[PDB]
Amino acid sequence: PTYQYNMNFEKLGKCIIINNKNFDKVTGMGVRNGTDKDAEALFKCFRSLGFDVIVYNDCSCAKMQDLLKKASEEDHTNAACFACILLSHGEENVIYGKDGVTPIKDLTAHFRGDRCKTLLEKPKLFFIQAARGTELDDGIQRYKIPVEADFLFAYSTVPGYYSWRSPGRGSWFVQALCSILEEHGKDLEIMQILTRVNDRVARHFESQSDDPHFHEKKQIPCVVSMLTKELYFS
């Protein structure tokens, strides 16, 4: 027999959304057109879920690190969990700030059970919409707890691969995540939701571009769970 995370708290929790769209020339990274659409859609979804959403924009690696560090120092006692969403450029293990790159590990470590006691035994979720490389998927027709426990990372793509988005519709992963959340965010368990998102971007999306190097390409998200209980946003 096994339970669900206790959700009986004054509030669901905070939800830091980092919307990186414009990057310094020095980095040479392009303008992430469509990210605003993503942020708007996410903002609404997580608000509906009951999160206290906040959106930061074009943050430097320093701001992002500071942002999350500060957050980890706030008092989450009356919160059920925590949520952070990263929308930016990225490379394996790293994510882009306005001025450069920072290891995703450093961003999330701030919430280890030993560095944010107020979140111990509470789920800490991180949704990352960013590339993790450039590979393309051609497809085919007396109690103590691990300081590292209760983390869940919902990546848009698999390690080493690219992440797709349309400046019009927005990120595939984000498009998918919002759909399922809107439809089942309040009745399905977190892993069911993310699994349906996996299938969604896997089946209902395919690249399409003038250059054949990037035509009819595919993508599969990646979920990493260190959760110790089932998670229902209610």
Binding site: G28, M29, G30, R32, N33, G34, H89, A131, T134, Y162, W164, R165, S166, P167, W172, F205, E206, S207, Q208, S209, D210, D211, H213, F214
Partner: peptide, 17 residues
């Protein structure tokens, strides 16, 4: 130094559909 790789490393590649 490959341009088809430029849009990649720089993230310019997107889905036109």
């Amino acid at each position: 130094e490959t341009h088809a790789d430029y849009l990649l490393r720089t993230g310019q590649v997107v889905d036109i559909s």
